């Protein structure tokens, strides 16, 4: 029914699609799973502080790689955050950053 909000069992790590196959004398499950296959270390920037009353903090991902606004946490590209990607929460006291 839902790939999202599922405890890990369909596939190792990320799971994309689920299928049902008729095994003899039973039910066979076939699932599509995503494995990174590579890891590159990049410095995160746990949110930022701006003159606007709601600061930009990146809720979905830990931080921004460069310029305190980056979104290359996926397979490829170096796209910079336009602030649409990061939801704006109520400002929290921290040093020139959401932290």
């Amino acid at each position: 029914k839902a790939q999202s909000k599922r405890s890990g069992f369909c596939g190792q790590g990320t799971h994309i699609v689920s299928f049902v196959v008729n095994a003899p004398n039973g039910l066979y499950f076939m699932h599509v799973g995503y494995y990174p296959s590579n890891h590159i270390e990049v410095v995160s920037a746990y949110g930022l502080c701006d003159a606007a009353n709601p600061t930009n903090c990146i809720a979905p991902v830990n931080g921004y790689f460069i310029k305190t606004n980056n979104t290359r946490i996926v397979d490829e590209w170096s796209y910079t955050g336009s602030s649409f990607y990061a939801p704006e929460p109520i400002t929290s006291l921290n040093t020139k950053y959401v932290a």
């Binding site: 790590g13 990320t14 990174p36 979905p60 830990n62 946490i73 929290s92």
Partner: protein
């Protein structure tokens, strides 16, 4: 927050406990600052076990 895969890597253990406590219960980081020796009380709980 490991929403997808292990890409999120690691975060400070003490900070992670505070953030998880804030999500799980109304206790908040400002309230935790007001609270005194919260870590010592947690250590006492481990000692009791």
């Amino acid at each position: 927050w490991t929403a997808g895969l292990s890409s999120f890597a690691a975060i400070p253990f003490a900070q992670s406990i505070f953030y998880r406590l804030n999500g799980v219960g109304i206790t908040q980081q400002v309230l935790s600052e007001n609270q005194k020796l919260i870590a010592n009380k947690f250590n006492q709980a481990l000692g009791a076990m």
